[PDB]
Amino acid sequence: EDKLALGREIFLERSEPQCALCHTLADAEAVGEVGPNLDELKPDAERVNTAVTNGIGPMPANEILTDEEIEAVALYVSTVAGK
Amino acid sequence: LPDYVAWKDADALIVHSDKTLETKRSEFGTSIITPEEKLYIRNNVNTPPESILADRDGWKVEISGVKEPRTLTVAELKTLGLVTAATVLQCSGNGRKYFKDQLTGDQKMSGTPWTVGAAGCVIWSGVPLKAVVDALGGPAEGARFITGTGGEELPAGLDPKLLVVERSVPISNLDNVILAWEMNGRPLSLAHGGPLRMVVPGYSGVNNIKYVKAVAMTEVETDAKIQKTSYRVHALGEKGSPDQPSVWEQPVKSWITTPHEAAKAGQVQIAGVAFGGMNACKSVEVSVDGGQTWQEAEFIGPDLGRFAWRVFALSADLARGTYTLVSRATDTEGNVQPEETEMNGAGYGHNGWRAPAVKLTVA
């Protein structure tokens, strides 16, 4: 309920590199065209969380970001994907 | 379906994402060749626009690492030689679902949950790289790899080596490598990397560079992310690193493709596809009881070469019930599919015979 806006901040500003630069997410007015358009992927929180933790392709294994943050972004994305 | 692939067959394909389309198991057919409008799609980054197909023959290709470096156009490549080859195009991810099936407890893995449809068999046509290299004086002394670079225009604001699709394979492949401008008798499509495609026979999809804009003979592998740490075979919980094996040579594989779901009791023709990667498939066995009993299958259609798949088939006579259809391939040097493939963190190269079993209700 509250931890969403944190995910959104993580998604648009706080992340390095920013998710929005690679991803498309309608809710965030993100138009990143390199990784999957996340509205089409409509991934669950667990999928997001693992991707950002373990890394995938050009996403590296997370190192400069704590777990409360990861779960925030995992909650935000999974929720808003294809609203 | 996504626009740049609006022409493809929506019913034949699972849309995992706009970057990621898998062929349904029932759609392969029994001709070997995969209908172009059903061939799978896997793109690591953004896609170029159609405008690069406006002038196919003017598309340029910088060839360095040769005694006489030159940028060539497709027009000039067409003059230097002609080669045609049938190969299996198959992502390293094909089968990732089956690795996810084996994760216990906390163990978690990312990536497209491909089953078997990130694979097709196609006939490429174009110029061989050996011709193009010998045209330019031969390779520079001590070249050890063929390194090709994707033509995508990378979006500004990020480090190029993080996103460029640039792969290196050993120079032992020069004899087999092809810069194809044509697929299955048609000008190469945008989806499949027209107007020009490096094709490395026997190797995973990642190594077949769509819209190749440079091709270099190099003493070292490229340091691009996609080569250094991605597409590497490591243990669960490990990170990818350039000492680990990369996804190069494809291993022996097969799956059942027909019948896919239901069948009447009696004679039933069970078929699928099989290949040995770098080698021809020598033989295939099928089981209807999921491993307990094996019978030798029959090859169907012609032999399109060592890097192509064969169709095989078995005539079985079946009583009513739920069967479990599985295939097990041996290539020409005697390599057999294991029951299940050793786990790896990224989930590449799945080639187990149990995981992709088909469930057949004979009614």
Ligand code: HEC
């Ligand atoms: C450019 C460097 C990116 C950054 C910044 C972010 N993502 Fe990403 N992501 C990118 C690509 C090219 C891909 C596809 C890679 C592949 O091999 O398919 C992805 C993938 C994802 C996924 C899907 C994960 C899966 O299991 O398949 C998710 C859920 C995802 N990315 C989320 C995500 C988040 C939350 C980011 C900010 C923390 C982020 N990505 C950044 C490219 C890039």
Ligand code: MSS
């Ligand atoms: N340029 C380029 N190329 C390229 C890419 C991209 O993204 N880009 N992808 C890869 C991969 S990775 Mo995995 O290993 S598979 C694969 C392939 C696919 O193809 P299609 O789509 O045609 O099918 O391609 C290849 N190539």
